[PDB]
């Protein structure tokens, strides 16, 4: 294939993981930041404390976006399949 | 029995390599094969099998149940002999790593991670240099144990 087509495919794959990974981690990132500010406000530094909120929120994020992640992956697989005849020629 | 000895040295190589934060069994396997050839171990085994014809005749005679259990108990022989050879080195590996951990524990910013990987492997290779320095004596004692087992099988 043409090198430009390879970069296109490479970029949209990296964009797919970036969107998917951020939608799952951003809720955990904010919660971890919130707990850290609260610990700083009360002048405590416990590394293992900010684990239960992050784990639960991440699990809640996975449950909430279950249909969205499946729909995104299934359409992406179909998109590559339909893009195959364009490449082979 | 011959495979048990060599693989025990392969066990000795890999325990040192595993403790060295790390193929090192092959280094010991090759050297132990040289020990087997240099000490005329192959000639002794051939002498053992022809002696087996004398004291264990072909017609009447076979390995009994006790011989099977003695041969099945050689796994404990492997670990005990492998640990005995490496006990001095493995203590050295632990104490330097523990000393490195406690000495650098003052600042939790440094930690070890990959920096600890480099330090551990350099010392582990150095300790293997010490292991090869006195490995021959351990092999001689190990061969005596193995040869005695072989004669027990052939009832010599």
């Amino acid at each position: 294939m043409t090198p430009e087509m390879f970069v296109e495919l490479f970029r949209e794959a990296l964009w797919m993981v970036l969107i998917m990974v951020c939608a799952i981690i951003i809720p955990s990132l904010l919660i971890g930041l919130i707990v850290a500010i609260f610990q700083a406000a009360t002048s405590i530094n416990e590394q293992t404390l900010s684990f239960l909120p992050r784990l639960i929120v991440t699990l809640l994020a996975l449950m909430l976006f279950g249909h969205w992640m499946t729909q995104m992956l299934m359409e992406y697989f179909y998109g590559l399949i339909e893009r195959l005849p364009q490449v082979l020629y | 029995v011959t495979q048990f000895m060599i693989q025990t040295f392969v066990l000795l190589g890999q325990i040192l390599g595993m403790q060295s934060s790390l193929l090192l069994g092959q280094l010991f396997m090759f050297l132990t094969t040289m020990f087997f050839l240099a000490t005329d171990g192959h000639l002794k085994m051939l002498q053992l099998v022809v002696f087996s014809f004398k004291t264990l005749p072909i017609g009447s005679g076979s390995l009994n149940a006790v011989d099977f259990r003695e041969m099945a108990g050689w796994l404990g022989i492997m670990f005990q002999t492998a640990l005995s050879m490496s006990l001095s080195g493995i203590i050295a590996l632990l104490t330097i790593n523990l000393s490195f951990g406690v000495m650098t524990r003052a600042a939790p910013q440094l930690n070890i991670f990959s920096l600890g990987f480099a330090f551990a492997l350099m010392v582990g290779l150095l300790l293997c240099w010490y292991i090869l320095a006195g490995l021959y004596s351990h092999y001689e004692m190990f061969w005596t144990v193995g040869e005695a087992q072989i004669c027990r099988l052939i009832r010599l």
Binding site: - | M18, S21, L63, F68, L75, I91, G116
Partner: protein
């Protein structure tokens, strides 16, 4: 009625061809290897004992524990056949029975019930069930039994590893991997208690 000499030879060579199957499906080879597989996996060594010596020790262990049944086959079947006391057909049956009895001693009632209903046959006594149905029930029981023994063997090594990790964390060094420190302790405690001899007693004697 009795098989001709030419046909008996053909049957003998056939069983020699299937000999690896009889070791790993009818004898105690499956349980010993699975248990020894757990022991290698439990300790930090991945391939250090190597596959060759484990099978070789397992083979010798099987010949040790199968010695009563093998001798019973020798006496009941081989000796009358060699002396031409009995025909080949009954000698083959006389050799099959001790193997069937041994497989019954190492199986469970629930496992037999599942497969006898699965085969869709009629039977009332476990003693006269076909060996074709006993074999899947035997190994299924063997795998479950081996997992039980392996689980018990895995606990002390898990105990040692958790203690070392807790000690290192309690001392404050959250940077050192517990595996490197724990490995000599697991090996030392495996040697000074003579662990393999204890495992031999609980494995060879587990059949009875």
């Amino acid at each position: 009625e009795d098989y001709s000499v030419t046909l008996q030879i053909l049957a003998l060579m056939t069983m020699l061809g299937f000999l690896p199957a009889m070791v790993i499906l009818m004898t105690s080879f499956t349980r010993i290897v699975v248990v020894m597989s757990i022991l290698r996996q439990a300790m930090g060594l991945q391939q250090t004992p190597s596959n060759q010596v484990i099978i070789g020790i397992a083979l010798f262990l099987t010949f040790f524990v199968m010695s009563p049944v093998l001798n019973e086959i020798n006496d009941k079947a081989v000796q009358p056949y060699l002396n031409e006391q009995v025909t080949a057909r009954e000698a083959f049956d006389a050799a099959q029975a001790p193997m069937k009895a041994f497989m019954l001693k190492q199986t469970r009632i629930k496992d037999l019930e599942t497969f006898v209903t699965m085969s869709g046959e009629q039977v009332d006594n476990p003693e006269d069930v076909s060996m074709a149905v006993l074999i899947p029930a035997f190994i299924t029981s063997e795998l479950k039994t081996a997992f039980q023994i392996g689980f018990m063997l895995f606990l002390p090594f898990l105990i040692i590893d958790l203690v070392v990790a807790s000690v290192l964390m309690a001392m404050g060094m959250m940077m050192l991997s517990p595996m490197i420190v724990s490995l000599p302790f697991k090996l030392m405690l495996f040697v000074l208690v003579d662990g393999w001899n204890l495992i031999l007693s609980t494995l060879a004697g587990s059949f009875a």
